[PDB]
Amino acid sequence: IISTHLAKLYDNLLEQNLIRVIEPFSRVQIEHISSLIKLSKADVERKLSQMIL
Amino acid sequence: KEQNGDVKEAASILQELQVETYGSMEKKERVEFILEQMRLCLAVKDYIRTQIISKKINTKFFQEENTEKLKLKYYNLMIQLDQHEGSYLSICKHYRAIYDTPCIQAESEKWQQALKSVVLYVILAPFDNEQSDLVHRISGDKKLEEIPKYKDLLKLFTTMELMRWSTLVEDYGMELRKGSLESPATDVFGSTEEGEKRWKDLKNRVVEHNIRIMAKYYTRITMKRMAQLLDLSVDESEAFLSNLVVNKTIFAKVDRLAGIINFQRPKDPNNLLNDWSQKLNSLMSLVNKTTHLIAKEEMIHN
Amino acid sequence: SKMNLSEEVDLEDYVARPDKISGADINSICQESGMLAVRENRYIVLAKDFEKAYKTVIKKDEQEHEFYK
Amino acid sequence: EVIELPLTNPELFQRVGIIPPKGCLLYGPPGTGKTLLARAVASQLDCNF
Amino acid sequence: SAGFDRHITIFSPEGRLYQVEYAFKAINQGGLTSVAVRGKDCAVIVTQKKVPDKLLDSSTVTHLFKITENIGCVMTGMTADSRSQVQRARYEAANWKYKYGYEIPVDMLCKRIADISQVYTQNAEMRPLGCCMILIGIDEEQGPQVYKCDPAGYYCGFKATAAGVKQTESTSFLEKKVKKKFDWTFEQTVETAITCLSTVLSIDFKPSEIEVGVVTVENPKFRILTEAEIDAHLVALAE
Numbered sequence A: 001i002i003s004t005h006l007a008k009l010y011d012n013l014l015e016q017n018l019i020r021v022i023e024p025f026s027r028v029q030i031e032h033i034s035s036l037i038k039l040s041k042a043d044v045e046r047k048l049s050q051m052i053l
Numbered sequence B: 001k002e003q004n005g006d007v008k009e010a011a012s013i014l015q016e017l018q019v020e021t022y023g024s025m026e027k028k029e030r031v032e033f034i035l036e037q038m039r040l041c042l043a044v045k046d047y048i049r050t051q052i053i054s055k056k057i058n059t060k061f062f063q064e065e066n067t068e069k070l071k072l073k074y075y076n077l078m079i080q081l082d083q084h085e086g087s088y089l090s091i092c093k094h095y096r097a098i099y100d101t102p103c104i105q106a107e108s109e110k111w112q113q114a115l116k117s118v119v120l121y122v123i124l125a126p127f128d129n130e131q132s133d134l135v136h137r138i139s140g141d142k143k144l145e146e147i148p149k150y151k152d153l154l155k156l157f158t159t160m161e162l163m164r165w166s167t168l169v170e171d172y173g174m175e176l177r178k179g180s181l182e183s184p185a186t187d188v189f190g191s192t193e194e195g196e197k198r199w200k201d202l203k204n205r206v207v208e209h210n211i212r213i214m215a216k217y218y219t220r221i222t223m224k225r226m227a228q229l230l231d232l233s234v235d236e237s238e239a240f241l242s243n244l245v246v247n248k249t250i251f252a253k254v255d256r257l258a259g260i261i262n263f264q265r266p267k268d269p270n271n272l273l274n275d276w277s278q279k280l281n282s283l284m285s286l287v288n289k290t291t292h293l294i295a296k297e298e299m300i301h302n
Numbered sequence C: 001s002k003m004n005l006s007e008e009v010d011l012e013d014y015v016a017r018p019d020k021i022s023g024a025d026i027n028s029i030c031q032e033s034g035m036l037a038v039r040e041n042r043y044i045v046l047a048k049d050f051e052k053a054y055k056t057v058i059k060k061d062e063q064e065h066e067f068y069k
Numbered sequence D: 001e002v003i004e005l006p007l008t009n010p011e012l013f014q015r016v017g018i019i020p021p022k023g024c025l026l027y028g029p030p031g032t033g034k035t036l037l038a039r040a041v042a043s044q045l046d047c048n049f
Numbered sequence E: 001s002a003g004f005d006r007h008i009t010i011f012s013p014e015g016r017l018y019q020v021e022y023a024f025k026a027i028n029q030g031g032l033t034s035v036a037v038r039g040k041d042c043a044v045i046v047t048q049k050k051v052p053d054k055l056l057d058s059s060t061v062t063h064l065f066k067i068t069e070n071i072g073c074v075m076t077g078m079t080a081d082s083r084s085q086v087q088r089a090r091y092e093a094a095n096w097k098y099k100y101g102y103e104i105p106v107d108m109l110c111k112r113i114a115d116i117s118q119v120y121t122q123n124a125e126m127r128p129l130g131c132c133m134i135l136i137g138i139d140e141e142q143g144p145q146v147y148k149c150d151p152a153g154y155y156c157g158f159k160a161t162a163a164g165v166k167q168t169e170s171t172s173f174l175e176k177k178v179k180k181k182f183d184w185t186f187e188q189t190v191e192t193a194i195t196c197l198s199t200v201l202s203i204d205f206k207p208s209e210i211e212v213g214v215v216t217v218e219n220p221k222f223r224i225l226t227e228a229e230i231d232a233h234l235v236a237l238a239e
């Protein structure tokens, strides 16, 4: 229960943070957004792809 | 108790008193007790209790005969409270009230300090319709001339052109922070901790005004030029612009890849054709008006 | 949730009490505790005020004339 | 103590959370000055009354 | 609902006897207040002594009636019915002594009084006696005892109590006082009773407006404190 719910909370937090950090940008490069969120480039790329899809 | 250094105990003892309950005592003495309670609370650093006490004391009573000292002290205490909170516009309103006091008005130095602080706190206050109206009202004060640099700064913050932070500092740092015997510098921008915080806030206000000017005039300013004109590092300028955009203060689209800060809102085809139609209608109306004037001119010089 | 409340106030202390009180009684208890706090010129509600308000609200026998029970 | 605190500082009432202080009552002997109490307390505000 | 409050033997729709409650309320018609405080080794009761006429005889107005040398009573409420109940209580105590030897304990005495009142309330023949009967008296093996036992027929053991117009306020004051465990001494008991009465009535309590009666373990005989003793107790109370 804790694992699943905390994973869902982590997903929600990542979504909110990514949406917050892309509001000013219009063509932000992935490396800068990953650094802003303090996450691996691949993880942010995958999350952004899922969010768009 | 205060004379013995036990400020907390004195504040605790004086807070328990309910001056408003003492209806027998004269109104002036009640207001003095409220002011003393507010001063003790602010000394204890209980700003919430100070705010409650200040709300206890009315403002209409200050329109009386011998309430000059009471008004001065109450407005100084409220200035302290709102300075700790950080609301510069309320501080400016309080200093304007202080500057209106006849005792402050009569003496040259007192009103001069009040007006200097009012101009500085209008400058520091965030841009807004209310703040813009307050600046407009303060600017049209003939007495501002006696303080040249402060009125010059006030005008500079209303002119629609960029002011560079480096140039503004080189021009006004001596006159605004340190002062001179002929320039009685205020404590608003002093060297104390609050002084440095308010100096940084003034720099933030200057950069905000610069960004507003660019958004009004520019359409696509590179990040390098924006940073140069705002007197900030590229990353810091980008962060400030992003913070402004998130709050909805200004519209911008930071294209970090090419360093583009395009300001123009997207031009939907409907709006573009509407602008073209408005231009055509204005042209037609102006052509008719010029034809009417042309007929008049031909008529007169037969 | 809306009330300012305080750290030292543990609502679980009051919840477990065996007294049978309706939701209206709970709302009255909260309002009375807040108003007692405001009367003493305190903007923070503490345990003493909540306990006093709870004791006041729970009291509903009134007279009862002592023999009906 | 009943009509002054709510009027002067609604913020402290809203800060605590308890908004409504309404109610009140002056039960007692008939017409011993009941209206006057609502008049004497009308020293501040109580305009329409 | 309201049509069942004309006979004492008719039950109300919700299960109430309205006439008994009406008599309870009538208790207050006298406009007086009486309080009893049970000390560690003493029982003291103080009642208002109202004389709203210069021609009255203050010696004949006292509400503190001595049922027996060892048992005491203070009648609050209607004067005539209170005096009738006091006479009945004296008869009951005398009969108990004559039939069983040992003096009837206060609890038994006005338990008999309350049983009489209840038998009055059950069979609809007589209006219930609208007068609260507060009993005091030292009982061997049970220390001081004060029992209040009322028209409807309810008697209970009381550490402190009061009957009259200002009963709720006096009982609340006693509850605020009775809780801080302390030496319940004769002087302390009298002082607490007088203080409770003064605060409830909000009066300066001139010596001629109060009447006190105390029963103690050392002297287990009902004694009505004179003006001098009451004044001395009041002066001690003030300081």
Ligand SMILES: Nc1ncnc2c1ncn2[C@@H]1O[C@H](COP(=O)(O)OP(=O)(O)O)[C@@H](O)[C@H]1O
Pocket (backbone or CB within 6 Å): D030, D031, D032, D033, D034, D035, D036
């Ligand atoms: N304590 C008092 N102080 C001043 N006026 C009083 C007082 N008691 C009665 N009055 C007089 O009686 C009138 C008030 O009656 P009121 O109490 O308003 O009756 P009701 O309670 O039926 O409205 C006023 O005209 C007033 O002059």
